[PDB]
Ligand binder design. Structure first.
Ligand SMILES: Nc1nc2c(ncn2[C@@H]2O[C@H](COP(=O)(O)OP(=O)(O)NP(=O)(O)O)[C@@H](O)[C@H]2O)c(=O)[nH]1
Length: 290
């Protein structure tokens, strides 16, 4: 859990840029469930045209078809997107491979200028909880000062044959300014942080599921709901079917809300990508020119 405040943000921007000076390529790590919404809002300014691998992590909890649209978008911006499951160690070879492709031009020009071949240097950057430390540990094949008061120095990790990975990620802040994006981040657990009302988060999730996977939502909770009912009816149906009640036979809404948020965060109902590319055309255009 990280506390952002005007100064701390400045600290992170500064420090991450400093680390970026040491590397040939940057791995922007995003959540495959929201490849666009889980990006730091100033990421391009911070990365500043550095060769970039965009890593859609938690592929195991998302939808491949939607992700592929996001991959196309990343390809169209000139990045090298790959998807991985850092936790269960799936597709990890792809990281080095993309790093090699991302820096192929740079090292060709170095080779032509007569420089000797060398390890590619990389770092990982992204908002919190996307799986940065998980990915680092999986790539190091080991868990990354042991004495109180003793400061750990940032070190290079040998990964594969051609890759050197900084063992410390650049941590940047999530998008703050948009309420829908807030709900997306809350649905994925990127922010388990207040002022975005949990009840509204659960309504957003239900409505997402009702629109994209109604059959699955119903079979999961074993409920059936009138199509012209308002959203409250769904809370009531689930609350009733799970027995989450209070004061006689009133619905314990706080409890149903928590169950919905949990089941969506932890992919109990299905594997979804909440960034629907075709629905985000205006948002994309707003960001696009800068
Ligand atoms: N199913 C699944 N879970 C993952 C995957 N990657 C990370 N997780 C889980 O996501 C949660 C956060 O992972 P973590 O590595 O701590 O995130 P982080 O980006 O390092 N946060 P920080 O900014 O503090 O470094 C953990 O519970 C982790 O097990 C993944 O690829 N698949």
């Amino acid at each position: 859990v990280i506390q952002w405040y005007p100064g701390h943000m400045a600290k992170a921007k500064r420090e991450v840029s400093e680390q970026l000076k040491k590397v040939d390529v940057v791995f922007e790590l995003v959540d495959a469930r929201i490849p666009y919404s889980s990006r730091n809002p100033m990421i391009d300014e911070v990365i500043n045209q550095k060769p970039r691998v965009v890593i859609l992590n938690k592929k195991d909890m998302s939808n491949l078809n939607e992700m592929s649209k996001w991959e196309q978008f990343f390809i169209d911006k000139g990045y090298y997107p790959v998807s991985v499951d850092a936790k269960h160690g799936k597709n990890l070879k792809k990281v080095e491979a993309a790093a090699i492709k991302a820096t192929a031009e740079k090292f060709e020009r170095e080779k032509a200028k007569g420089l000797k071949p060398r390890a590619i240097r990389a770092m990982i950057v992204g908002i919190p909880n996307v799986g940065k430390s998980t990915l680092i540990n999986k790539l190091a094949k080991r868990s990354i000062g042991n004495k109180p008061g003793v400061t750990k120095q940032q070190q290079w990790i040998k990964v594969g044959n051609a890759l050197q990975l900084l063992d410390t990620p650049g941590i940047l802040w999530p998008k703050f300014e948009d309420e829908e994006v807030g709900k997306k981040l809350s649905l994925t657990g990127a922010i388990k942080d207040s002022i975005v009302h949990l009840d509204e988060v659960a309504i957003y999730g239900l409505n997402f599921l009702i629109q994209n996977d109604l059959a699955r939502l119903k079979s999961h909770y074993n409920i059936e709901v009138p199509e012209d009912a308002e959203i409250i009816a769904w809370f009531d149906a689930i609350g009733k079917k799970r027995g989450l009640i209070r004061r006689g036979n009133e619905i314990d809404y706080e409890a149903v809300i928590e169950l919905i948020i949990y089941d969506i965060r932890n992919a109990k109902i299905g594997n979804y990508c909440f960034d629907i590319f075709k629905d985000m055309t205006e948002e994309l255009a707003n960001d696009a020119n800068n």
